Design a protein around this ligand. Structure first.
Ligand SMILES: Cc1ccc(C(=O)NCCCCC[n+]2ccccc2/C=N/O)cc1[N+](=O)[O-]
Ligand SMILES: Cc1ccc(C(=O)NCCCCC[n+]2ccccc2/C=N/O)cc1[N+](=O)[O-]
Ligand SMILES: *[C@@H]1O[C@H](CO)[C@@H](O)[C@H](O)[C@H]1NC(C)=O
Ligand SMILES: *[C@@H]1O[C@H](CO)[C@@H](O)[C@H](O)[C@H]1NC(C)=O
Ligand SMILES: *[C@@H]1O[C@H](CO)[C@@H](O)[C@H](O)[C@H]1NC(C)=O
Ligand SMILES: *[C@@H]1O[C@H](CO)[C@@H](O)[C@H](O)[C@H]1NC(C)=O
Ligand SMILES: [Cl-]
Lengths: 537, 533
């Protein structure tokens, strides 16, 4: 040391760190980027649970984001911002278990409520270093301590031969847990309060949060949780041990590998790209909103299905914020349902709707499919292309997010949790996806993190004010278990979601409007009737 | 003698009677025999034409009511008694009634023929709500109504037997239609313009005449109020008819010939006493002896026939009342009564769905319950009550009607559809029942025009509108007044726009889709489901 900035030097369990002073619109923040929290899970450690990072010597430079965990990269629309913004923005490597910290500058004087972000990406993709996950705005404007970690995705994170020692499954979730332990031991050195840790995540990140809620060793590592557009329950976030075994075995065959020990040993000799290049090929049916390698119900991390666990758990101690965007499903249609594209209006035919339902509900028998079609058909205009288009999107949206969220909120509420629910209805003026996609999956995130406060990003003034409201809701919830501003009454209030009143709020440019019932009739179909229908055919 | 009251028909001379309607006199000829009394060995048999008679047959009085069960659930109560027989019971009951204006029309006049309902187990053409004088006086109509055999006497069947072939109550109707062709011209009626109209089982009967070729040369237009030949209650298979007839026989102590012979020795009331005991399930809106798919009067099931028929020649007016189901709940479903608000629990609601949909599997009944529950208030007694009613009305009338309208329109027919939403100010059933099954009829027949019935002025004005639509439909096949040039008008029901009108105190309103989402469930999904279970 000596001639550097004394307000950026910090020590953690593993050694000394040097961070960097970043500019946010309203003033400086402290960033500590690319802190290793585990031994690199490379070589003989592929598919293995992470081990704690061994201490380093000297001052580790923590001024740049580290490698992105090895993953599939999206090529559907080359150079198109709407997809590229989700793509990896650092080198791909199996050596990727690093986390990031943003704090006020100078670091706070008294212990400060901590937010931990867990990114989504269907458990096959994602990075804590993407622009839309920039912690500088929350840190500066709200004083937050924000932590985001990389966790293994795809095969490296979730390939499992359940019961084996060399590929037990869920190691990507264990990566997340280790970072949560890391925060408990170390965040006080940044001025963070380890006794006030709130998780939040979107999509698969949201399901991840749900799984930490349902896994008792994680429960002592956080106090509050936010789930954006994702649930541990539902049709995509988990797979049985049997199906995980089948998928892992198939992928092995596809890449040359013929006793679990031998199979896995062969898999470890494969280049990481050979695994990625065959990842999408092990799905049992033509599907959208399905992902090959995801958490497995192993009887360990998850002692039973999420459905069983949320049905029979005590949650009096728990405060959760859950919600959805207006058009959860539209995004997914163009990655598989014939007739859909980002470059036209995607008006489809009844025939294409019927084919789309089979793809969006890949597990449905012919009867169950017909039930879906009859429910979502408008029988005053059963062949109107526009209606069939938006119905296809609603089928995928409802089945995958909105009704799993509706069930989660309902079960948690019935079992003592304090639940707050929202629907996010504002479409970013900057959005590059077509209008027909409305407010797609993932496009509330940039507002929660407060990107519109960045003048160079060309958001409107109203969007700027909006983002600020949202940042207050999330941070007030992190601080108190309550999104409402205590020092405020004039602004409309956000009631808890109950089973009796089923209240939730609209989040848009207008002030909070309280609504009752979260697709109540339609989710009764998905959550109550469909399972019995499938079970009888 | 008044020459206006003397008519000669092919069977001999009739004398009728002059009756007062609020705006003037009408000629009525009541109690005209159109068949040989279907008594003794002629029980369960096809009717035969009435033999000629000497002198002048007195036709100034309603004849006897076909032998039937009499309702006793609420003894003395106007709301039920108004449907009970108002003349003596007799198997000797095959007679019809004719109202015409006074004096007899000088031009041949459109004929309306009323077929009563009563679940094929009851009914009579002599009920006060079927009084034809108002239509005859105000609209100058010639109106005809016949008694037809009901219950075991009209529909007990041993398919394929000669002595109980089934459907004879429908042949009773057909013979009266033939009679009208042969004789109505003597009353001033136009045999070349005959419109059937009927309600509930009557509507269904009308529907079956549409689907039976020998009936088609006897009428030109049809009105089906709150009833269809398709659906769950209007017909039974040959096998199920055989089963019920055999069970009834067993129950009263009885080779087909020998079975039916013993049945013919049984006093009438002995059959009625066990009539309601041959149903396969604990049911409501389900009747023991109804038309049978004999492969003769009905060459195939009504759904097969309306699915394949050519109805380009046809004009039809069809409709429903607001609360088709309410009436029936108090006749079986625990929790329901006319004497309290019938607020039920969720348990009772599930229990009542099994009774309202007797043929549903566990899964199918769960589907009904899940579809009709308001999940914003899944346990609210008022919603559950009103939903129980809706299940029964939608399953049995509204969706069957919507299917018929749809298939007829798609296959060339000219269709007009309504929903009747005015509740009679004189109604004696409780408010929660709303506008029950049957309570449009008194308005169509023009009863409010009678000062002594204490209807309101607006209800009088409304009855005159309804009589206008119905008679205009009879004259032209189009219920719209060809002189009233003010919008809106009653548009044709089509498969595309699915337009129908509301009938109430306010001017016609045009709506689209007759419970389309809900009827898609009943008409399209449920049958896949019962089948798959
Ligand atoms: C190997 C592979 C490759 C593509 C898929 C696949 O389903 N692609 C469709 C696009 C999904 C959307 C991703 N996304 C975009 C923005 C914000 C969040 C998210 C994810 N939220 O969870 C699936 C696989 N696979 O699992 O085999
Ligand atoms: C032997 C018997 C006795 C009673 C029933 C039965 O279902 N009773 C319930 C009441 C039905 C409503 C009758 N009704 C009332 C006013 C206006 C029209 C109508 C009928 N429209 O069609 C059924 C049987 N049975 O069939 O065996
Ligand atoms: C939109 O484009 C896709 C791919 O180019 C195509 O499959 C689809 O038919 C198109 N739809 C319309 C309505 O142009
Ligand atoms: C904002 O608008 C300016 C106008 O010149 C443009 O140059 C810039 O690229 C825009 N930024 C974004 C993020 O769209
Ligand atoms: C209404 O009355 C009937 C019989 O009198 C009874 O069985 C039923 O429980 C009552 N309903 C209510 C809601 O009290
Ligand atoms: C009409 O009301 C009067 C009482 O004002 C009553 O005397 C008469 O009997 C009523 N008529 C009918 C048919 O109810
Ligand atoms: Cl005689």
């Amino acid at each position: 040391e000596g001639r550097e900035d004394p307000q950026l030097l910090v020590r953690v369990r593993g050694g000394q760190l040097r961070g960097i002073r970043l500019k946010a619109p309203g003033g400086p923040v402290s960033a500590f980027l690319g802190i290793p929290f585990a031994e690199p899970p490379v070589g003989s450690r592929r598919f293995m649970p992470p081990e704690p990072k061994r201490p380093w010597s000297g001052v580790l430079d923590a001024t740049t984001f580290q490698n992105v965990c090895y993953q599939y990269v999206d090529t559907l629309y080359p150079g198109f911002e709407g997809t590229e913004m989700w793509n990896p923005n650092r080198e791909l490597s199996e050596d990727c278990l690093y986390l990031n910290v943003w704090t006020p500058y100078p670091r706070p004087a008294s212990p400060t409520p901590v937010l931990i972000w867990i990114y989504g990406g269907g458990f096959y993709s994602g990075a804590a270093s993407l622009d839309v996950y920039d912690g500088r705005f929350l840190a500066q404007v709200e004083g937050a301590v924000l932590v985001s970690m990389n966790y293994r995705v795809g095969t490296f994170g979730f390939l499992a031969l359940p019961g084996s020692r060399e590929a037990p499954g869920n190691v990507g979730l264990l990566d997340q847990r280790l970072a949560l332990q890391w925060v408990q031991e170390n965040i006080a050195a940044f001025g963070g309060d380890p006794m006030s840790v709130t998780l939040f995540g979107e999509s698969a990140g949201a399901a991840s949060v749900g799984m930490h809620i349902l896994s008792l060793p994680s429960r002592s590592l956080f106090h509050r949780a936010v789930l954006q557009s994702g649930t541990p329950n539902g049709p995509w976030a988990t797979v049985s041990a049997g199906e995980a075994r089948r998928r892992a075995t198939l992928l092995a065959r596809l890449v040359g590998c013929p006793n679990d020990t031998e199979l896995i040993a062969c898999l470890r000799t494969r280049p990481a790209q050979d695994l990625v290049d065959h990842e999408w090929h092990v799905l049992p049916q033509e599907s959208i909103f399905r992902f090959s390698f995801v958490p497995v119900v192993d009887g360990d991390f998850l002692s039973d299905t999420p459905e069983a666990l949320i049905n029979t758990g005590d949650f009096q101690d728990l405060q959760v914020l859950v919600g959805v965007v207006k058009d959860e499903g539209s995004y997914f249609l163009v990655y598989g349902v014939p007739g859909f594209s980002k470059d036209n209006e995607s008006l489809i035919s009844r025939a294409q709707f019927l084919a789309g339902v089979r793809i969006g509900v890949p597990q449905a028998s012919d009867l169950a499919a017909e039930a879906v079609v009859l429910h979502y058909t408008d029988w005053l205009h059963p062949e109107d292309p526009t209606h069939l288009r938006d119905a296809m999107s609603a089928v995928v949206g409802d089945h995958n997010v909105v009704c799993p969220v509706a069930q989660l909120a309902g079960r948690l509420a019935a079992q003592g949790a304090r639940v707050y629910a929202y629907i996010f209805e504002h479409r970013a003026s900057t959005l590059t996806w077509p209008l027909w996609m409305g407010v797609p999956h993932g496009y509330e995130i940039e507002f929660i993190f407060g990107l519109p406060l960045d003048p160079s990003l060309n958001y409107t003034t109203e969007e700027r004010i909006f983002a600020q409201r949202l940042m207050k809701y999330w941070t007030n919830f992190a601080r108190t278990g309550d999104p409402n501003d205590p020092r405020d009454s004039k602004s409309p209030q956000w009631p808890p979601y109950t089973t009796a009143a089923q209240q939730y709020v609209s989040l848009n440019l207008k002030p909070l409007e309280v609504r009752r019932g979260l697709r109540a009739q339609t989710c009764a179909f998905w959550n109550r009737f469909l399972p019995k229908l499938l079970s009888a055919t």
